[PDB]
Amino acid sequence: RLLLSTSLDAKDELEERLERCMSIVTSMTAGVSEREANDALNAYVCKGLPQHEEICLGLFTLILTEPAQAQKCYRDLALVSRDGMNIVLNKINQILMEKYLKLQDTCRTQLVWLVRELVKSGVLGADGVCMTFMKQIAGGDVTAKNIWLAESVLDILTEQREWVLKSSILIAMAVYTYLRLIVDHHGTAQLQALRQKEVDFCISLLRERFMECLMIGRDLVRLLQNVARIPEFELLWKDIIHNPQALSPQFTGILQLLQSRTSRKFLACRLTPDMETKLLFMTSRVRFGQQKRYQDWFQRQYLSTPDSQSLRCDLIRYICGVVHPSNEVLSSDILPRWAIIGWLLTTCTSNVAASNAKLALFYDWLFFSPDKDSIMNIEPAILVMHHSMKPHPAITATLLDFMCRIIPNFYPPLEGHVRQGVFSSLNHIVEKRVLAHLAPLFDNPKLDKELRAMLREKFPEFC
């Protein structure tokens, strides 16, 4: 067969479609010379639409089968494709993001070769293929084969940087993903050279496409702060400080970047489809109480590595920014997100991991804007504070202390914006009363004295 499996594995109907495609494409060729073969092939393709799609998928699978046959069948596919294979590329995306868990290594290599051929030839819609293949890279992992795949696609992208240039959104996607890989990867001399290549490419993209990097969002700064020790980023930051218009005339300054918003695509794209689908299933089907089994399974299977601590922060950011449930499902008795946030926070077994997770939680709180943002970014927080008062006071106290002390520490020239965002969030909680009264929580008897004192001092309005 092609995909690794055993007898107990389910008979995959997509794979049976692929097998039927193998049958028609091979048995029709019959080892005759390519001339009559492509003549008959074009006849069968032009007979109708579903058989055209079947021939295209057979050619695609043959490209994943054997090298010489991959060359010949890619030749034949480029020769016989009618619509430019756009829906064929769609099915390539589906097969890719669905069956990559079971794809064989030789098939992986030949699929990478096909991706390189498509990118070099400049076939339309290749940006979608590039960004969905990019999405399958798992963050916070050190498997040799995954790192090799990342290096190979990086090489593909570097040789075709102009194709990235003509694809506006792909610039932002690629630079963000490679920054995430940079903060993930370290440890070996080969990884050091890989780090050098990635940082050089990212700096070149950032300078040459600063205007395009504007729409990435505030998380760009979050990636920058972890890789600020390299003198290139320090030089770029100093150049921005001295004259932000120098690098881009329309780029007035950091005001637009700070006031801007982060789109869900960047937060979503670093996760493989399986984890996102599991979280959607949990937030759509799992009732309150059963969350322990699924999350423990995911933790033991995957989140059991040194880099998993930052992966927890990544998952927290994904939940906060991307997951925006409806109010109708909120009213129902489905599993509240406070339990999810509590499980995410309690698994931080190191102080640095907890600090990173809390910074991730408070990243949206810096620049709150009621008109363009939903209350879903603070409802799990207030629910955690209200629900964890009795059973787990420690988590509530730690979060409150961190969010109270981050206000002057973060940036005194822009601490006023932090206070403005906190006041906006408090006003948003007041106007949409999730809780009956906020008064008992502000001056809770079991909380420490200084916290309540500074809460009274900073916000006399809510007193």
Binding site: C46, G48, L49, H52, R82
Partner: peptide
Amino acid sequence: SPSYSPTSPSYSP
């Protein structure tokens, strides 16, 4: 399909 009358043959691929 303004270039083909509705009572004209349909080119089924």
